[PDB]
Amino acid sequence: DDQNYVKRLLPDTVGDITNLLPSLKEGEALIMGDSISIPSIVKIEKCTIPPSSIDIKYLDEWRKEWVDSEFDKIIEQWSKS
Partner 1 sequence: NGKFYRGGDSLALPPKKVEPAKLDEIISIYSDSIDINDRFTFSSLSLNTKVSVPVNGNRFFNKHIAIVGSTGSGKSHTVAKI
Distance, in Å, from the CA atom of 13 to the CA atom of 68, rounded to the nearest integer, reads 55
Tell me how far apart the alpha carbons of residues 75 and 81 are, in angstroms, rounded to a whole number. 10
Report in angstroms how near the CB of residue 15 gets to partner 1 at its nearest: 17
CA torsion sign for 10, 15, 16, 21 is negative
Indicate the residue among 37 and 52 with the shorter CB distance to partner 1: 37
Total of chain residues touching partner 1, rule CB under 8 A: 3
Contact between 24 and 16 under an 8 Å Cβ cutoff? The reply is no
Measured from the CB of residue 72, what is the shortest distance to partner 1 in angstroms?
60
Interface mask (CB under 8 A) for partner 1, residues 7-46, using x and -?
----xx---------------------x------------
Residues within the interface to partner 1 (CB under 8 A): 11-12, 34
